[PDB]
Ligand binder design. Structure first.
Ligand code: K
Ligand code: MG
Ligand code: MG
Ligand code: MG
Ligand code: MG
Lengths: 58, 183, 350, 137, 40, 161, 48, 133, 182, 49
RNA sequence: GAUGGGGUAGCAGAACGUUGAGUGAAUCUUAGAUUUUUUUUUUAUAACUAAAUAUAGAUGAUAACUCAAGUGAGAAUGGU
């Protein structure tokens, strides 16, 4: 199992679990391209006031 | 580090071992056949085995700095075994730094004043590390001339049977069998 | 001033609020880091993780405070730990079962769990501080979480005149850990033994809330995994929570109850008798079987030590290191439940 | 009669059950006027944006510090702090130092003495003279 | 030191010593050692 | 020695003899009972519930007793009527009918006499003072050696000794 | 954008607002040297 | 895969049933006696590992309990046990200076050494059930 | 909580190796016991140390307000029949403090000051050597008996915190090996 | 002397010394809180600049 | 999965530090510049973090690059 890693030459390489096997390296010039959760992603999660766990799960 | 995490109490305790200078020793004897020719352990071969006990080097936790030694009670030192003509031809020398004052004495003349226990203390003393623990270790060697000594109650026992006694081995195997009745 | 503009844009009526606003939690780097540090799922927003840091002493309002998140969380921790402790050690006495519960989910360990997450506390609660800091008022002791335990009528006489309490009653009247229920401002002062306890209580409430917030957002299973990972993963030597009074008498009562023949102390090995540091190895035998072994320097101490080890072995019997818990059934289909061993209670003797 | 002791608490083992990165904050102080901060300014523009995205559990705080060398000061969970001066270093050297602060712990440096460190008892108890087959001198 | 002539400052501290020891006056902390705003 | 590596070799201790007989051409399991004191988590078979299937013959089986030290005997020589006389005498003259006199008269243990009867409060306080006056004649060397004997007994019962 | 000073850190922790009251209560300067002037005892003696 | 010995198939359940278990793992050939929860401080900087990576150790010479010990000829079969670790970052030592010098020669050459060490944490050490094998 | 006075004497016409022995004689003693030992000493500097020890006590009482509770303390001892306090100094000397305000010499050391003068020693072969006439000062730290009653209680508590002597101590095995030797 | 007098007041608190009743300083011979005539009248000659 | 690794006389290369100078009428400093200390971290003859003490707005300090040397001392029965 590997964790999210930034490679200087290539870019950010997401976490991979070789037990269930995927080295995806996303490079770009914007936060969204890297594949990480940005401030905008955190504001859409805070506006989802209707989502709720199912009663059986709870 | 797990192997040494635990109770070290009994690993550092002082055990009171016992050995007779007259009982034949199949291991420390140079004559290994026939059964009737097996001799006791010689002076230097008994002393080398005792120096190992006084240093605690027989333990798996031995450390030269820590004094993890044990006690050794040596009896029947009057019949201390020796080969050749050592008893009457070996000389012990002593000097006090003053020229002229060299004191010499044979092994037999040294056994008439302080018995055979002194001849054994000199052998074990020279086999111990020359440092600040040499006198503590050598003090745990309690050598006596006959079979009488004040440590007949200190000698390590297993089930009431003193080690080296007729039936001490069987008493030890009986206690370990009950130890296996557990998870 | 003109040379030093404020680092954080805040309205003028922000230093008077009890705690920062909810929308303030969406611009702090401490929360976003504390959220990713605990690997919390994206279902839990930053506005909820910001509400777990506002103690009930910094904000009196029922909302905006940790009081109701900490309660629901305390129930999950105290429950999942108890069922796991009984399934692991089904013979523990009731007294030690409270100290083991307090050793895992008590305020002291929770304080170390809160500090292991990199949670810094705020000096004084206020709206200006960033929501990423645990904010509480240690000076105010008028904060107490609702507990299922009831108040004892003799509590006044209990502390003053040293009245007896008893163990069987602590299960109903006392709290989960057996404790008794209900046991301007100038900052020119020093720490106090009460503030030290109030600060510890604040850290404990935060950790409980994180489990309560996970339950509401992520459900039951997510909360159990969190408790199992951060709280149950800790190591505790339960053998060191044992204090015995007249152990030899207790062992005789145990053997008498279980019908075992009377215990007999036997000298397995001894050395250095008549010395400064002797060693006596004694083993207590019930007939042929060997119950416990004890090695001490005194003949009496060796017999007492051996009796304690015989009792520790009885109370510390464990069916398995990772035994099944009854809570594994209510979740998705699992193997049929197997009855767990139920002890008949600790031995009471003279 | 068994009485419970109420002065012993459980000890946490980071890495067992859950893992928590010790480095909880990283201060990045630069200077717009100092010549030694030339590389740090490049690291903040080309390598920090991605290094900060790969470590979402670290609080990065970039603030200026004129008339002073640039430093990387990481704060750890145990309360201690490690500061590294990166004066006259190239951007990629700043990233090799920032990786040292992330992989490191607040603990002070110590000489290598023993590989393994354990708090649990021995599976096979410590050696005891009396619990064996006996030894004959 | 034993031969130095006692000045007026040493003759005043010997009278205060006899007043404090006897019990006439009661000692109190100084109030002019420094002019602090805290006044504590 | 000069370096740490040289010190490690001079202080070397080989592993146990059993770990030196490594197998060849396969894996095996060997019975290696260590010469050490077992913990309290190795529950004896007598303390295991009947349901527990882990109960099994000794591992050895899958491949007289030592001297007595303390074997007490309980005796009940005091009848209910004799317990009322003990309470009368003790409360009548606590100085003459001490727990030792009554222990010998009724062939009982000194503890039992105290279980069924207690001396008057005045007499008890007189006993605590007698021992208190004896504890003030001790020097600093004997008063500290007696305090250690009281702490070693409390540490023993806490599992610290 | 600017240098973080000890004062800014106190504001973040919340301690600053408590310091303003104590200093103002004791008539001490908050972010200043006050209306007191520089040492002039040596200046009046002709010190250079 | 070679079948496990029948003698190992009858005593492994007795070995896994006991309370505690230890193992001697081999990293790059060097042994390390560890238990679940131990913190191994390797005397080298493992290349290509960040704090949080999970390793799977597969070279174990000895897996034993108090009374029972499982010894593989070269190594124990990977199917019998399961051991895993987690990288807890890297640590360093205080810079130690070695002064190389000879008698009657003023020159003192300095050697500065500061090595890094990877720290692991044994988070799983379990013996598998081999009834199927 | 504890009063203290550090008094530096004047410039005495002597050396450190001579006055060092007079500052070690009054160390630990009470101001009264020290003044009785300086009045009957054969040293010429004992008369200067006696006047400089009376000035220190005059400042300790007027400025620091030390030793001003003898009348109040004497009451509890006799009026109420109280048991005085028994302590032991760091050296081991036992004392019975009936007045906790009694002044004593906590610390004392000697420093060397400027050179008094320079005398010329004219030896043989037309050789001259400068002889430096020395000048030294002494510093005494006067405290009350509350400092000694507190320092003693701390030492007693530090001895009751190291635990008792156990017969079989659990000494650590400070050597790691990747195997079991038993 | 005021840098050390202000630290004792802050620290000693109720035990602050009554310095006004202390002896003069042999360095200059001035009492506590008192100047010298040369410094109180500013009679010390100054340079032409 | 590059090769190489002791060193005197001696030869060679690459750097740090010290004093002064240019950019400099520049940059920063009671929101603490500077403080012979202590402490912390970093492959480290050096700098850095923090703490403590004191109180400066320039007759203060200073990055970077460059220029010039009264530039680096356990060793001269050396000098003061
Ligand atoms: K400084
Ligand atoms: Mg002449
Ligand atoms: Mg070579
Ligand atoms: Mg010279
Ligand atoms: Mg000279």
């Amino acid at each position: 199992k590997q964790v999210r890693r930034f490679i200087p030459g290539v870019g950010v390489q997401d976490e991979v679990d070789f037990s269930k096997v995927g080295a995806v390296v996303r490079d770009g010039k914007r936060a969204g391209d890297l594949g990480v959760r940005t401030r905008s992603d955190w504001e859409v999660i805070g506006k989802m006031k209707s989502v709720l766990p199912k009663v059986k799960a709870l | 580090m797990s192997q040494t995490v635990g109770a070290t109490r009994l690993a550092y305790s002082r055990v009171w071992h016992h050995i007779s200078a007259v009982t034949p020793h199949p291991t420390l004897s140079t004559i290994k056949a026939p059964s009737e020719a097996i001799t006791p352990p010689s002076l230097g071969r008994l002393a080398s085995r005792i120096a190992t006990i006084l240093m605690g080097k027989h333990k798996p936790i031995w450390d030269p700095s820590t004094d993890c030694g044990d006690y050794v009670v040596v009896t029947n030192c009057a019949g201390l075994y020796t080969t050749g003509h050592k008893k009457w031809r070996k000389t012990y020398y002593r000097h006090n730094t003053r020229p002229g004052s060299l004191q010499a004495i044979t092994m037999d003349a040294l056994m008439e004043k302080h018995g055979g226990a002194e001849v054994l203390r000199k052998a074990v003393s020279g086999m111990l590390p020359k440092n600040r623990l040499r006198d503590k270790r050598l003090a745990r060697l309690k050598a006596f001339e006959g079979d009488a000594h004040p440590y007949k109650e200190n000698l390590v026992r297993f089930g009431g049977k003193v080690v080296g006694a007729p039936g001490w081995e069987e008493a030890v195997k009986a206690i370990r069998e009950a130890d296996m009745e557990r998870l | 001033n003109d040379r030093f503009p404020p680092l954080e844009p805040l309205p003028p009526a922000a230093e008077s609020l009890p705690s920062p606003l909810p929308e303030r939690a969406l611009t702090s780097a401490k929360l976003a880091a504390l959220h990713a540090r605990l690997n919390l799922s994206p279902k839990i927003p930053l506005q909820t993780l910001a509400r777990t840091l506002v103690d009930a002493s910094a904000d009196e309002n029922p909302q905006f405070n940790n009081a109701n998140l900490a309660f629901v969380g305390q129930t999950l921790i105290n429950y999942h730990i108890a069922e796991w402790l009984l399934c692991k050690y089904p013979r523990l006495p009731q007294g030690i079962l409270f100290s083991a519960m307090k050793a895992y989910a008590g305020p002291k360990p929770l304080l170390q769990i809160a500090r292991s997450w990199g949670v810094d506390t705020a000096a004084v609660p206020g709206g200006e501080v960033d929501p990423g800091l645990l904010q509480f008022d240690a000076l105010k002791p008028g904060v107490a979480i609702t507990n299922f335990g009831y108040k004892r009528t003799e509590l006044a006489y209990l502390e003053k005149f040293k009245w007896r309490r008893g163990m069987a009653s602590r299960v109903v009247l006392d709290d989960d850990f057996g404790d008794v229920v209900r046991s301007d401002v100038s900052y020119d002062r020093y720490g106090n033994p009460d503030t030290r306890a109030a600060a510890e209580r604040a850290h404990a409430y935060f950790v409980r809330a994180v489990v309560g917030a996970i339950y509401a957002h992520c459900g039951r299973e997510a909360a159990k995994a969190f408790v199992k990972a951060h709280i149950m993963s800790r190591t505790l030597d339960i053998a060191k929570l044992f204090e015995f009074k007249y152990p030899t008498r207790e062992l005789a009562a145990l053997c008498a109850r279980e019908d075992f023949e009377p215990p007999v102390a036997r000298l397995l090995s001894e050395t250095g008798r008549q010395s400064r540091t002797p060693v006596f190895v004694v083993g207590i035998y019930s007939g042929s079987d060997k119950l416990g072994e004890g090695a001490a320097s005194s003949l009496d101490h060796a017999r007492f030590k051996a009796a304690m080890n015989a009792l520790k072995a009885w109370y510390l019997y464990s069916p398995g290191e990772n035994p099944r818990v009854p809570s594994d059934m209510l979740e998705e289909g699992a193997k049929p439940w197997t009855p767990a061993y139920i002890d008949m209670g600790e031995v009471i003797s003279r | 009669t068994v009485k419970a002791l109420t002065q012993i608490s459980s000890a946490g083992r980071n890495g067992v059950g859950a893992f928590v990165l010790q480095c909880k904050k990283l201060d990045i102080h630069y200077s717009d006027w100092a010549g030694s901060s030339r590389g740090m300014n490049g690291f903040i523009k080309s390598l920090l944006p991605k290094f900060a995205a790969a470590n979402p559990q670290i609080e990065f705080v970039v603030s200026p510090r004129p008339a002073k060398h640039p430093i990387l000061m990481g704060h750890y969970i145990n309360g201690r702090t490690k500061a590294i001066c990166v004066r006259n270093m190239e951007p990629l050297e700043i990233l090799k130092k920032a990786e040292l602060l992330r992989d490191a712990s607040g603990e002070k440096p110590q000489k290598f003495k023993k590989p393994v460190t354990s708090t649990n008892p021995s599976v096979r108890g410590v050696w005891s003279p009396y619990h064996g087959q006996g030894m004959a001198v | 030191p034993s031969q130095f002539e006692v000045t007026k400052d040493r003759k005043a501290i010997k009278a205060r010593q006899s007043k404090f020891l006897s019990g006439e006056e009661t000692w109190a902390p100084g109030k002019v050692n420094a002019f602090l705003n805290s006044k504590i | 020695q000069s370096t740490a590596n040289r010190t490690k070799r001079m202080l070397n201790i080989p592993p146990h003899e059993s770990f030196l007989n490594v197998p060849v051409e396969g894996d095996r399991i060997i019975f290696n009972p260590p010469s050490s004191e077992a913990s309290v988590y190795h529950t004896p078979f007598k303390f295991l519930p009947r349901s527990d299937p882990r109960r099994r013959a000794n591992i050895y089986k899958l491949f007289d007793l030592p001297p007595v030290l303390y074997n007490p005997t309980k005796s009940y020589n005091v009848t209910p009527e004799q317990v009322e006389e003990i309470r009368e005498l003790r409360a009548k003259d606590p100085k003459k009918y001490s727990v030792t006199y009554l222990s010998n008269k009724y062939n009982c243990t000194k503890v039992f006499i105290m279980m069924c009867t207690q001396a008057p409060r005045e007499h008890q306080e007189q006993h605590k003072l007698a021992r208190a006056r004896t504890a003030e004649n001790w020097g600093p060397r004997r008063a500290a050696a007696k305090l250690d004997a009281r702490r070693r007994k409390e540490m023993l019962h806490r599992g610290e000794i | 954008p600017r240098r973080v000073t000890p004062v800014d850190k106190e504001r973040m922790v919340g301690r600053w607002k408590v310091i303003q009251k104590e200093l103002q209560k004791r008539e001490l300067p908050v972010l200043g040297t006050g209306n007191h002037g520089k040492y002039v005892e040596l200046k009046w003696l002709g010190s250079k | 895969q070679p079948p496990i010995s029948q003698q190992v198939k009858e005593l492994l359940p007795v070995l896994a049933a006991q309370p505690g278990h230890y193992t001697t793992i081999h990293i790059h050939g060097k042994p390390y006696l560890v238990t679940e929860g131990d913190t191994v401080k390797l005397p080298f900087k493992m290349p290509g590992v960040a704090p949080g990576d999970v390793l799977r150790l597969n070279r174990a010479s000895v897996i034993g309990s108090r009374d029972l010990t499982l010894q593989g000829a070269p190594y124990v079969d990977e199917r019998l046990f399961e051991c895993r670790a987690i990288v807890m970052g890297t640590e360093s030592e205080p810079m130690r200076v070695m002064i190389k010098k000879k008698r009657r020669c003023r020159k003192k050459k300095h050697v500065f050494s500061k090595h890094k060490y990877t720290v692991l944490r044994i988070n799983q050490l379990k013996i598998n059930d081999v009834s199927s094998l | 909580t504890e009063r203290k006075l550090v008094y530096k004497t004047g410039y005495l016409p002597t050396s450190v190796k001579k006055l060092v022995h007079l500052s070690r004689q009054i160390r630990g003693k009470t101001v009264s016991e020290a003044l009785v030992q300086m009045q009957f000493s054969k040293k010429k500097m004992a008369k200067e140390v006696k006047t400089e020890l009376l000035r220190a006590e005059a400042k300790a009482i007027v400025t620091r307000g030390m030793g001003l509770g003898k009348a109040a303390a004497a009451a509890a001892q006799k009026e109420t029949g109280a048991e005085p306090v028994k302590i032991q100094t760091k050296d081991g000397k036992h004392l019975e403090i009936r007045d906790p305000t009694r002044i004593y010499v906590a610390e004392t050391f000697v420093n060397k000051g400027f050179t008094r003068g320079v005398e010329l020693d004219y030896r043989a072969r037309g050789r001259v050597f400068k002889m430096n006439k020395p000048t030294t000062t002494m510093t005494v730290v006067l405290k009350e008996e509350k400092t000694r009653i507190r320092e003693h209680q701390e030492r007693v508590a530090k001895k009751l915190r190291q635990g008792p002597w156990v017969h079989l101590p659990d000494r650590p095995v400070t050597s790691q090996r990747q195997f079991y030797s038993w | 002397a005021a840098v050390e007098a202000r630290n004792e007041d802050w620290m000693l608190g109720p035990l602050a010394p009554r310095r006004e009743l202390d002896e003069i300083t042999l360095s200059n011979g001035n009492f506590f809180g008192s100047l010298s005539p040369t410094r109180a009248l500013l009679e010390s000659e100054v340079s032409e600049e």
